[PDB]
């Protein structure tokens, strides 16, 4: 019966390809060929942070745009006060292999995950004055790539088992599981409304998932190699993807096909992290050329290069109020950049 | 000045945290790290117990050095996408089963186990990250091969092989065949050693290899290289 099933699947693929052909009318450049260019963008390091002794892999801003959390391979989770460069907490870890970290919106819990295939939850505000483990979620078969909190009692995770999962923390049991990826997924960015969330995998495919019904809704393709990073537009109707080749892409949601690509001749290496500014005009990316780049989203032209790291830029983040940009590389350093007037 | 009392207290807290981090790094610096790889057929679960989840960690102390052995073979994912986390290790221990040339893989029966080990070694030796990391080769199941080579020649997997069917000639031929796969024979040193029942001697071999690599690293640090 495989023959007929394959033939009808191919027919449906042709049907959707024709539908996408009907959808596409004009490219983004034909519309954004008249707006004013953003001009030169120059930023410098207002403050620098030190204390790690190994490569930094993850970094997440708090909800108040003041407190920071960083994770590195020496087995430490450090919470920084970026205003005056003090350390408020230094949590030791049980496993030294981590690749993600998060900050709960309220500001009471933090989360960690790595090669150990378990998600650890830490509680900050207690009566006795030390951080403690609150939950150790387990059940995934494969390394965890990213974790993001939902409501201080729910969490969503993505792993190398080609699977995403949704958990509640009290009982510590899975509620819904998302499957449909051939290669392993390595990035997810939750929507502001916490109703839908998108994920990009290593098979050059991105997908949309509903958080309650737990089924795939839209499937996006257009890349060749693996997809390494993803981020959500502040509006909630678009998202950007970073690729293992020297390309980035922007997708809209009500139209399944892509809008614009970001590439250049001199750049050959891939993209590690991607983040958006709050106004949605600037697109920040980290590369393997030991520097970060800024793209004008509506025009796909370079407008700024942040140099100053001696190794690969691993993590990149933007505050909620959009006042500073945080960057972390493999040289055991963290940096906070902000332009001057 | 222009700072409050609570600012002073926070500054002292930060200084204490920095001191603790420095001491932790000082303690963690003097430790050797070994990464264990190889085909999952055999030879990996035996050397791990000769010394005495997705990742497994083992600690053992020998002649006043601390050894951390990392075994990751149950991860079952894309090796490229996480093999870079192990850059900076002292050495890679590769275990190769020897009495499997006659043996045939369950999948792709026309394709032999020995060729799978060969391609694994060719992929791991010439990787971009491990350009200076030494590789310690462990050829396993000597007795099984001795009782097996007496019946079948290497032509079942090595048709071009020539020479006598005795044990020593075949063992030397296989060792040379595996050592020939190295391309950058200026920085790497491949140490080969056939295993036996006694576990004390294997630890001595890994100790000597680690000592040589660490002395080379110290010479590189001082610029005398």
């Amino acid at each position: 019966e495989l023959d007929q099933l394959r033939q009808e699947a191919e027919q449906l693929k042709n049907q959707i390809r024709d539908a996408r052909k009907a959808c596409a009318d004009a490219t983004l450049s034909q519309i954004t060929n008249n707006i004013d260019p953003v001009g030169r963008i120059q930023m410098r390091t207002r403050r620098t942070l030190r204390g790690h002794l190994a490569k930094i892999y993850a970094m997440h801003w708090g909800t108040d745009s003041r407190l920071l959390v960083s994770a590195s391979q020496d087995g430490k989770l450090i919470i920084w006060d970026s205003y005056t460069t003090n350390k408020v907490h230094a949590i030791p870890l049980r496993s030294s292999w981590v690749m993600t970290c998060a900050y709960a919106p309220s500001g009471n819990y933090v989360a960690c995950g790595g090669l150990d295939n378990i998600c650890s939850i830490y509680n900050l505000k207690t009566r006795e004055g030390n951080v403690r483990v609150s939950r150790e979620l387990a059940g995934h078969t494969g390394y965890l790539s990213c974790c993001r909190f939902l409501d201080d009692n729910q969490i969503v995770t993505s792993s190398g088992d080609t699977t995403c999962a949704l958990w509640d923390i009290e009982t510590g049991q899975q509620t819904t599981t998302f499957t449909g990826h051939t290669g392993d997924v390595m990035s997810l960015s939750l929507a502001p409304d916490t109703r839908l969330f998108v994920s990009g995998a290593c098979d050059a495919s991105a997908k949309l998932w509903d958080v309650r019904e737990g089924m795939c809704r839209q499937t996006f393709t257009g890349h060749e190699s693996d997809i390494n990073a993803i981020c959500f537009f502040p509006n909630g109707n678009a998202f950007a993807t970073g690729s293992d080749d020297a390309t980035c892409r922007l997708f809209d949601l009500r139209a399944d096909q892509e809008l614009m690509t970001y590439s250049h001749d001199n750049i050959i290496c891939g993209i590690t992290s991607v983040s958006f500014s709050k106004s949605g005009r600037l697109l920040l990316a980290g590369y393997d050329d030991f520097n970060c780049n800024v793209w004008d989203a509506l025009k796909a032209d370079r407008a700024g290069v942040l140099a100053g790291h001696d190794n690969r830029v691993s993590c990149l983040g933007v505050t909620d109020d959009g006042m500073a940009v945080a960057t972390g590389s493999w040289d055991s350093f963290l940096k906070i950049w902000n332009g001057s007037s | 000045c222009t700072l409050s009392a609570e600012d002073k207290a926070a500054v002292e807290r930060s200084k204490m945290i920095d001191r603790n981090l420095r001491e932790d790094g000082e303690k963690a610096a003097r430790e050797v790290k070994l990464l264990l790889l190889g085909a999952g057929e055999s030879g990996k679960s035996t050397i791990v117990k000769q010394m005495k989840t997705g990742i497994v960690e083992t600690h053992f102390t020998f002649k006043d050095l601390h050894f951390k052995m990392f075994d990751v073979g149950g991860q079952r994912s894309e090796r490229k996408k996480w093999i870079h986390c192990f850059e900076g290790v002292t050495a890679i221990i590769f275990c190769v089963a020897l009495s499997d040339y006659d043996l045939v893989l369950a999948e792709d029966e026309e394709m032999n186990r020995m060729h799978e080990s060969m391609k694994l070694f060719d992929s791991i030796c010439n990787n971009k990250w491990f350009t200076d990391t030494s590789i310690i080769l462990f050829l396993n199941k000597k007795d099984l091969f001795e009782e097996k080579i007496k019946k079948s020649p290497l032509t079942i997997c090595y048709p071009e092989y020539a020479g006598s069917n005795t044990y020593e000639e075949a063992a030397a031929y296989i060792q040379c065949q595996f050592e020939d796969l190295n391309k950058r024979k200026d920085t790497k040193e491949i140490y080969t050693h056939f295993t036996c029942a006694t576990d004390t001697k294997n630890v001595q071999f890994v100790f000597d290899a680690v000592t040589d690599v660490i002395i080379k690293n110290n010479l590189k640090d001082c610029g005398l290289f």
Epitope: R66, L67, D81, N86, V88, R127, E128, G129, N130 | T2, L3, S4, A5, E6, D7, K8, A9, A10, E12, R13, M16
Partner: single-chain antibody
């Protein structure tokens, strides 16, 4: 969390006394320690201060020289040594914890205290309300007054509120003039700007009986107000 102390009683003049604070139920090395004396029929006055790691040691002018304060972190104990006593040192003492970092709440816990009876510039806080009779269900406001401005360029105002019931230890209600602690109900509120400082209670329960205190924590001489007495 508990804090029990020992030592004291009747002492002849010219002697010496060892006072001990023994802590159990929480981490200790991350906390700084304070001592506070209580006048026989008046408000409290600050005495000493030791910080975490035994780096900074602070005293009061009236007790300098003959007072010493030390700690033993591994055994979780705190010591005060007093010499050359006199009729002034007739008070019942309290042992207080405080932790300092971004977002922390200093002066969260208080102890029971022990009695010491003996035989025969600084910013000033004034509360001139003395005593006021109120009935349950009637909203109440309490005023505290300073001399110098209590606002620093870091955007923080250092005023603390305390409430003392008859037969109990003080409890913290408001820190940094505007924030509630843990265990306090919602009906307590606080506000004010510059010098005049206001505390408001909307609903009154039977348990809301006693003396209210305002405290400053800007300059290290820590002075208490006269206090507000509330009764039915």
């Amino acid at each position: 969390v508990q804090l029990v102390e020992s030592g004291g009683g009747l002492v002849q003049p010219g002697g010496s006394r060892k006072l001990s604070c023994s802590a159990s139920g929480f981490a200790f090395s991350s906390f700084g320690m304070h001592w506070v004396r209580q006048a026989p029929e008046k408000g409290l006055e600050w005495v000493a201060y030791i910080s975490s790691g035994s780096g900074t040691i602070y005293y009061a002018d009236t007790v300098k020289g003959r007072f010493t304060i030390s700690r033993d972190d591994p055994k979780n104990t705190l010591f005060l040594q007093m010499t050359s006593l006199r009729s002034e040192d007739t008070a019942m003492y309290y042992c207080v914890r405080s932790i300092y970092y971004y977002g922390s709440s200093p002066f969260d816990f208080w102890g029971q205290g022990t009695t010491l009876t003996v035989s025969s510039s600084d910013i000033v806080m004034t509360q001139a309300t003395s005593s006021v009779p109120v009935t349950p269900g009637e909203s109440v406001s309490i005023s505290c007054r300073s001399s110098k401005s209590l606002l620093h360029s870091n955007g923080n105002t250092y005023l603390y509120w305390f409430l003392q019931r008859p037969g109990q230890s003080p409890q913290l209600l408001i820190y940094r003039m505007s924030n509630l602690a843990s265990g306090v109900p919602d009906r307590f509120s606080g506000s004010g700007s510059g010098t005049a400082f206001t505390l408001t209670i909307s609903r009154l329960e039977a348990e809301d009986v006693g003396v209210y205190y305002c405290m400053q924590h800007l300059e290290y001489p820590l002075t208490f107000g006269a206090g507000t007495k509330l009764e039915l």
